[PDB]
Amino acid sequence: MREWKIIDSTLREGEQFEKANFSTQDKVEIAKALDEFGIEYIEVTTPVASPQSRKDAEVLASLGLKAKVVTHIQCRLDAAKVAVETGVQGIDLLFGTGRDIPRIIEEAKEVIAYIREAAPHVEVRFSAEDTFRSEEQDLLAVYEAVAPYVDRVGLADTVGVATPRQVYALVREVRRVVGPRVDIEFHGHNDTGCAIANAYEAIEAGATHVDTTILGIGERNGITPLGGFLARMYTLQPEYVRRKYKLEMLPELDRMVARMVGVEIPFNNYITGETAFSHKAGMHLKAIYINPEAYEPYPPEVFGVKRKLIIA
């Protein structure tokens, strides 16, 4: 352990997907299915976006889910006021992307202080945008100074270019500077095909929270997808992962979202893709008969799917 939790952002990051147009009822459906699956956090679009987004945040946070509902805002006093008034259990601050460091630290601490005052029980996370491309001394200076005042700090590979060893290294440095009592969140975009690998490296480096969306939907080609992330973690911690989540629900989660946003599940999608458990090579089929484990990373039944043997 390697203990960690998932922050689903389907209703935040989520909404930034090109084809997403979630009704209130769509979001409630998604949130209840995630809660049933066992997801620990559900992050929702800033209430400042529209009066709509505010309402949705209000409803989601009062659904009585076991998951904590958390909203994502710019690191600003005005947005923080709106956020606390919604009743969310958490607020995820993003300090947007040079101006001096004591001032950045100043402005951050002010927002965080407002929130502690107005809503002492709300969990606060602080991230700087584009964390891995920010110059590192100043980044660590900010995180070190803000960490004593927050429950969690986050790192965001905003443009999807961080490399796995870079993510590992910077998470380790952040852990060094913030100490063992502040949680560490990773958010990574998939532009260079590293969102799952980077989330995994983040956890190996000490990260405690990973952002996912169902099918990885999000800005551009999206972020770490729930199913791909769970496949990656299941192979390493199968006992922990199967006890944490209702893994057999994955196909229904992927279907629900695909139907809502109007896409097909891709044909190679982790676990639930048409092709995810198809075998064809004769020497593979030879082995699967004696033991399917021979060419399978995990059992399809665990995730509520079946293998396919192509015997032509």
Distance CA 77, CA 97 (A): 17
Is 71 an interacting residue with respect to a second copy (CB under 8 A)?
A: no
Among 121, 209, 279, 284, which one carries the catalytic annotation?
Answer: 284
Comparing CB distances to a second copy, the nearer of 116 and 259 is: 259
35 annotated as a binding-site residue: no
Scanning 31-39, 104-112, 185-193, 248-256 for contacts with a second copy by CB under 8 A, the matching segment is 185-193
Scanning 144-152, 154-162, 175-183, 244-252 for contacts with a second copy by CB under 8 A, the matching segment is 154-162
Comparing CB distances to a second copy, the nearer of 106 and 264 is: 264
Is 283 an interacting residue with respect to a second copy (CB under 8 A)?
A: yes
Distance CA 187, CA 112 (A): 21
Residue from 284, 299, 304, 305 touching a second copy (CB under 8 A): that is 284
191 annotated as a binding-site residue: no
Is 53 an interacting residue with respect to a second copy (CB under 8 A)?
A: no
254 annotated as a binding-site residue: no
201 annotated as a binding-site residue: no
Is 76 an interacting residue with respect to a second copy (CB under 8 A)?
A: no
The per-residue DSSP string of the chain comes to ----EEEEEEETGGGGSTT----HHHHHHHHHHHHHHT-SEEEE--TTS-HHHHHHHHHHHTS--SSEEEEEEES-HHHHHHHHHTT-SEEEEEE-----HHHHHHHHHHHHHHHHHH-TTSEEEEEESSGGGS-HHHHHHHHHHHGGG-SEEEEEETTS---HHHHHHHHHHHHHHH-TTSEEEEEEB-TTS-HHHHHHHHHHTT--EEEEBGGG-SSTT-B-BHHHHHHHHHHH-HHHHHHHS-GGGHHHHHHHHHHHHT-PPPTT-TTTSTTTTEE--HHHHHHHHH-GGGG-SS-GGGGT---EE---
Distance CA 178, CA 125 (A): 13
* Residue 21 CB, nearest approach to a second copy (Å): 9
183 annotated as a binding-site residue: no
Distance CA 170, CA 240 (A): 26
Residue from 37, 95, 245, 277 touching a second copy (CB under 8 A): that is 277
* Residue 133 CB, nearest approach to a second copy (Å): 11
Comparing CB distances to a second copy, the nearer of 67 and 162 is: 162
Is 208 an interacting residue with respect to a second copy (CB under 8 A)?
A: no
Distance CA 105, CA 125 (A): 14
Residue from 99, 103, 121, 268 touching a second copy (CB under 8 A): that is 268
Is 18 an interacting residue with respect to a second copy (CB under 8 A)?
A: yes
Scanning 29-37, 75-83, 111-119, 291-299 for contacts with a second copy by CB under 8 A, the matching segment is 291-299
Q: For residue 121, indicate whether it is catalytic.
A: no
Which residues belong to the annotated binding site for 2-oxoglutarate? 12, 72, 125, 158
- Annotated catalytic sites, by residue? 284
Residues of this chain that interact with a second copy (CB under 8 A) are 16-19, 74, 96, 158-161, 163-165, 168, 190-198, 200-201, 204, 215-217, 219-222, 225, 228-229, 231-232, 235-236, 263-264, 266-270, 273-281, 283-284, 295-298, 308, 310
